[PDB]
Chain length 334, copies 3
């Protein structure tokens, strides 16, 4: 645990399995302490900056609550202005921020941006999200998996990412398998697989640690034995709207529905999903896409799965805050 | 007072007259305590979310100061992003926020949004403003009226809303008359009256409580005997600009000016107005509208009334903060 | 020091040389105390408003950290909404804010706006930046100059502003020379000189205080003997892009480079610059301007000077926070 003090948190592969175990134990302690009304503040007098170049309105909440609970003050710097590196270089920005703040949370674009912030600020920099990795969500998922399979090592678990696994969360799961020996199934069309070189590197590491990484288009063999099925949205705003039709055509067979859950053969399989999810007609955008592409009842997951007892998405969402807090406490307090 | 603990505050009609009296007494105590330098913080360790879908830059101030004074921390989520229910359903948003925050203040659109937040968050949700009601402003006005008519019950007071009463504040005043027995005069062109069914319902209730609700186009009989004349702006950005000419033509006879104040026959009549007000040429928009529609000297209220000794608009504005604070304290602290 | 209590800070000329000396001593004490882990909070329970009509995303950081360190709470009101005086008059806004907040920091447009805020709010108002002055940056520069020339009075120092001195910082330096007896050199094309009347007024004052103000196009005589060379960007977004070519043509001879530094004849000359600076190709805008106008290697300052041992820009940037804090402490705490 002492190995975290004054260090950044830029991706999971910068840490050992034992360090990850200690971090998740801290998150679980902080969660229990707050639930029981006995949280001990370790960050009184610390000032934290949130550099959120990529942002939704709600994104800041888990980070602010984590800091506030621990006694720190927060300065939120959102995506309304220009990007970092537009008017001022990343190195210059890092040097200025590092004299003002005790810690910096980053959410944005290329991994090199957060590496430069970490190198030149002189204070812990925590990667919430980059193009390459989604460490904040990964930690939240890992804690949630432990809570719902108590007393199991990660190398005893099987996790499925269904749908479009070619993104920063797919990469973070590859890292998790590499480090912890997780049995990881990326169940996806071949065009939606993470890059082969990173897959090959993490697969060699995972093997050494008692795990395995499988990429397959076949849903029945892919999800068999799963303890958890994770998915996320199939289309994003920014990727051109005229590509949505072919992407949806490719991905709609990979919808997490009651059939896919039953194909695991595991009555205790649980469902995960980085929020927001398009699972019904109760959003303007979800209702439009359901009508335009024929997806009433839910897109990447059905309303039935999303609201089922197997769905643990709101525990997962809450656990973002507890694991963010563990990172801040472990790196800022001795 | 104990009846408020862990409850939402969604509209005045959810409360009894006695509960309202106790709430306003708490606001007056908190105001006195702060003025005398002896405020006791009841909200240390509480995290409050401000979900302000409809916002002006200044709107957050009264809510943040109220929370800060009481020791709470605040996360402001403004109207720059997408609306709630665009990308994530209201129910999903409520469930996530309710695990993070101890209380949620909402300012936005339909009343059903704030009802859903209240139902699914599991924490107190306070309605600052919806399409239907303006509870935060109503409480501020009621406290201000008590302060300027000490020792009078609301059923001993006469309040006039002059101008366009067809809006959320008109509805909140109908509720206030229904509940407290206020003598309420909506002095307005018939096209600018609140909906007849809500008027009829509140009129039956008001009668039972010793009050009365009058809707009239006649200014002389409408304002006679008034203790307070309230008004607000006649045109809003969003309503189409080409409708302004007919609206102003309809409403300009209802300007609160020295003549209307004298027609009350009450030398102690006071003037109220939810800020901002267009009362002179010292705003870019007010100066343009004054020139375009012939309203130099003030629109819905003249500069003379606005700056007169009868004007209590800045006491009213300050009392937003004290009454907001009373709602937060009454619902979050036992 | 007692003369600051409950006063605004609108421009340097509102203060005496002795008051400025005491303010900078307070800033140096607060800086030392924080570095040594023994800061004593003087602003617990104070609520401060940041009215930043002109804003970059990073601008709020120094003000928030200063307030947070001292125990105050902050409400940031940014430039995303409409300007003050668009929908509500400055006087009305000042009266409302002054009942809510203990102090108000302003960054924006005309000096009359901040004067009106100060006059009608009833609480200390601090001018961070207006069209006419840049007091926050001036105080940071003065502290930085003292730190790098310990035991020297300002009337023993020579400061150069190279480049376009016709702006709010040039005006603030004229005031500093007027008040402290600084030897101030504005080394600039004649079209980029501050207004003659303000120059003549401050020159009369500076003479009385043992200083001098020189405006010259001649770089060799202008910078000779300098203790410090300050500069800032040559072109701003808002000024029309088609004027950039002639402005750059006029200003590029005034680039702070190794040659200009050597022309001082002073091996210990230091370099200052209100950040951000365009000193290399590591910003999108800087790289485009370097390519379009032939300025690879740096615009108003070369990368070599900017990264040299003589460059003290990051000490200067940090000292914004310590001097802001001194203003808040001196005016809010007895």
């Amino acid at each position: 645990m002492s190995t975290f003090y004054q260090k950044p948190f830029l991706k999971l592969l910068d840490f050992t399995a034992s360090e990850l175990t200690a971090l998740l134990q801290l998150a679980a302690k902080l969660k229990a302490d707050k639930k029981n009304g006995k949280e001990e503040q370790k960050l009184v007098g610390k000032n934290i900056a949130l550099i959120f170049e990529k942002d939704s309105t709600r994104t800041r909440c888990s980070f602010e609550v984590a800091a506030y609970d621990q006694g720190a003050r927060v300065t939120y710097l959102g995506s309304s202005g220009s990007q970092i590196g537009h008017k001022e270089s990343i190195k210059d920005t890092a040097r200025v921020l590092g004299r003002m703040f005790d810690g910096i949370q980053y959410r944005g674009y290329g991994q090199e941006i957060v590496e430069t912030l970490a190198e030149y600020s002189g204070v812990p920099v925590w990667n919430g999200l980059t193009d390459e990795y989604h460490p904040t969500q990964l930690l939240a998922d890992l804690l949630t998996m432990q809570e719902h399979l108590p007393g199991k090592a990660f190398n005893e678990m099987t996790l499925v990412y269904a749908g479009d696994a070619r993104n920063n969360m797919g990469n973070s799961m590859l890292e998790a398998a590499a480090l912890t020996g997780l049995d990881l199934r990326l169940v996806a069309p071949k065009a939606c697989w993470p890059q082969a070189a990173l897959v090959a590197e993490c697969s060699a590491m995972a093997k050494k640690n008692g795990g395995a990484i499988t990429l397959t288009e076949d849903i029945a063999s892919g999800v068999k034995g799963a303890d958890f099925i994770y998915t996320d949205v199939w289309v994003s705003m920014g990727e051109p709207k005229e590509k949505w039709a072919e992407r949806i055509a490719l991905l709609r067979d990979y919808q997490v529905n009651s059939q896919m859950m039953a194909l695991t053969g595991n009555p205790q399989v649980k469902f995960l999903h980085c929020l927001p999810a398009f699972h019904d007609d109760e959003t303007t955008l979800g209702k439009k896409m359901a009508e335009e592409y024929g997806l009433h009842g839910g897109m990447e997951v059905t309303d039935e799965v999303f609201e089922s007892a197997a769905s643990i998405v709101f525990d997962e969402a809450e656990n973002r805050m507890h694991t963010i807090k563990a990172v801040m406490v472990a790196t800022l307090s001795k």
